[PDB]
């Protein structure tokens, strides 16, 4: 490789190292399951149930 290519490559390596270190200075984006409960939107498709009418009888 050329000298200019080597110097530019070293500069890009330095930039990558610097950006990942600044990432180490950043805020964690981890959702701490299970101590922090998973937020689920109201129409989330998980466990199936059978429900009751307002009178208390089963709707099925």
């Amino acid at each position: 490789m050329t000298l200019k290519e080597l110097l530019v490559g070293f500069g890009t390596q330095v930039r990558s190292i610097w950006m990942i270190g600044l990432h180490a200075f950043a805020k964690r984006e981890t959702r701490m399951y299970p101590e922090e409960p998973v937020y689920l939107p109201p129409r989330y498709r998980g466990r199936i149930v059978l429900t009751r009418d307002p009178d208390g009888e089963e709707r099925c």
Partner: protein
Amino acid sequence: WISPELIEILLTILKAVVILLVVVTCGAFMSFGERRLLGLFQNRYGPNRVGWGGSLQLVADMIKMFFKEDWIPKFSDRVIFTLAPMIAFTSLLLAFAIVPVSPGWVVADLNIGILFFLMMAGLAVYAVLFAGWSSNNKYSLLGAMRASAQTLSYEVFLGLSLMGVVAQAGSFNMTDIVNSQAHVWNVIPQFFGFITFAIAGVAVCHRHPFDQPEAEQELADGYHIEYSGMKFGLFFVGEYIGIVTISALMVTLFFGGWQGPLLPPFIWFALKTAFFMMMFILIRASLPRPRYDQVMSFGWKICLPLTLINLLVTAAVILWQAQ
């Protein structure tokens, strides 16, 4: 049995044993710290549940690898297969055996020094070759051949990168190398020596981006793939102990060793060593992995001429100011 010479003999032996135990535990807890610092670099936490802050994660890994079933392949050659992790551990451990961590705290004040380090590096490439061949896996054999050719391509200039520091000190002794850095640390005059030694030290430790079992995973050609239990653990802990040894050698050869203005000398040595260990982690986190031919061509075409030119220029400078 009451004599100052005998008391000094057991004092020196106890200091050597303390250095050995601290280095081995530092390598294992640096496997743990590798996990935690990669978590820090990637906006996460890493292992922080097994003990306080994950501090017992290493103990859990050690128990798991001890009580994992011991396995040797039936078609493998048992002696060489067993022997390869032993060399991968002991080579860079005995390379640490020359590092002066404090004034008066050294295991072996040898007249050869970094020559002993070069001896240990050659035995380390033996560990990689033996692990590849003894597994009776042709993929592991091919991967170990590539890893060994890479390691030779960088060990060809490792010592030459150290020769500028040796020339400035006028000695192979490590304490004389430290004492020659009393005014200016060697990273300023031997800057190209420092960068070539750092690249070669990463390469001979098979660290990223020179890690063959992680470089090519689609071929399944890693030379670790038949190792399990405590032999794979020996490979892991030996790799981390090698990182610790390379960091300590870089500190003592290019960053004044234990020398510092205010703090105690061991505190300065430990701080500089921990900084270079952390820089190993950041190198693993940040840089991508070049191609195999590109890596070996970089070692042969760029770094080795740079070490030769650096040695010649260092000699010219030394003889120029020798009035």
